[PDB]
Curated annotation (Swiss-Prot), chain A:
Role summary: Component of the Mediator complex, a coactivator involved in the regulated transcription of nearly all RNA polymerase II-dependent genes. Mediator functions as a bridge to convey information from gene-specific regulatory proteins to the basal RNA polymerase II transcription machinery. The Mediator complex, having a compact conformation in its free form, is recruited to promoters by direct interactions with regulatory proteins and serves for the assembly of a functional preinitiation complex with RNA polymerase II and the general transcription factors.
UniProt protein name: Mediator of RNA polymerase II transcription subunit 17
Full-protein interval shown: 247 to 295 of 687
Remarks, miscellaneous: Present with 1720 molecules/cell in log phase SD medium.
Localization per record: Nucleus
Origin species: Saccharomyces cerevisiae (strain ATCC 204508 / S288c) (Baker's yeast)
Family: Belongs to the Mediator complex subunit 17 family.
Gene for this chain: SRB4
Complex formation: Component of the Mediator complex, which is composed of at least 21 subunits that form three structurally distinct submodules. The Mediator head module contains MED6, MED8, MED11, SRB4/MED17, SRB5/MED18, ROX3/MED19, SRB2/MED20 and SRB6/MED22, the middle module contains MED1, MED4, NUT1/MED5, MED7, CSE2/MED9, NUT2/MED10, SRB7/MED21 and SOH1/MED31, and the tail module contains MED2, PGD1/MED3, RGR1/MED14, GAL11/MED15 and SIN4/MED16. The head and the middle modules interact directly with RNA polymerase II, whereas the elongated tail module interacts with gene-specific regulatory proteins.
Superkingdom to which the source organism belongs: Eukaryota
From Swiss-Prot, chain B:
Effect upon mutating residue 31 to A: Impairs interaction with RAD3, reducing the interaction of TFIIH with the head module and consequently resulting in a reduction of RNA polymerase II CTD 'Ser-5' phosphorylation
Name this protein carries in UniProt: Mediator of RNA polymerase II transcription subunit 11
Classification of source organism: Eukaryota, Fungi, Dikarya, Ascomycota, Saccharomycotina
Disulfide bonds: none
GO BP annotations listed: negative regulation of transcription by RNA polymerase II; positive regulation of transcription by RNA polymerase II; positive regulation of transcription elongation by RNA polymerase II; positive regulation of transcription initiation by RNA polymerase II; RNA polymerase II preinitiation complex assembly
Length: 49, 108
């Protein structure tokens, strides 16, 4: 009822030029959240056991 | 009481679930130790090998013994009945009571 649906149309945008800046931090911080997940994994398993 | 064979069968089964409980407990300690191993202290590193080896050897032989029990089930096949004599034994005891009634020197 809001609108006749033709809303989403294909479009093109270029990929941002890569560098050392963001991937290394992205992956080390992913390491951080997965070390977190390991910690809560161990804690939950200990509580369950 | 039950014949002995059933007695050692139930003892072996009880040993089986106690071994399973020990396996679960050792899983708990190995999960515990891996956390600090990931933390970064290498002192408890030697204990890790021992814990893993004991965990695996506890997991294996328990299942092996249970397999032996299930195998025993295979050859144990072929290897109110009491009522057939029940009245008789009742009969016996009743007459015994009469004897106690019949002799006044034993009613003390």
């Amino acid at each position: 009822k809001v609108v006749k649906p033709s809303s989403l149309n294909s479009d093109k945008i270029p990929y941002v030029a890569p560098t050392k800046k963001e991937y290394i931090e992205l992956d080390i911080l992913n390491k951080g959240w997965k070390l977190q997940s390991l910690n809560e994994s161990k804690d939950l398993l200990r509580a369950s056991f | 009481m039950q014949p002995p064979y059933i007695q050692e069968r139930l003892k072996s089964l009880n040993d089986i679930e106690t071994q399973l409980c020990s396996m679960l407990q050792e899983a708990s300690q190995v999960t515990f130790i891996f956390g600090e191993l990931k933390r970064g202290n290498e002192s408890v590193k030697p204990q890790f090998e021992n814990h893993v080896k004991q965990f695996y050897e506890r997991l294996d032989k328990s299942t092996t013994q249970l397999r032996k029990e299930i195998q025993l089930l295979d050859e144990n096949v072929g290897t109110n009945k009491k009522a057939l004599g029940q009245d008789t034994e009742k009969m016996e005891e009743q007459l015994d009571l009469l004897s106690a009634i019949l002799d006044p020197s034993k009613s003390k």
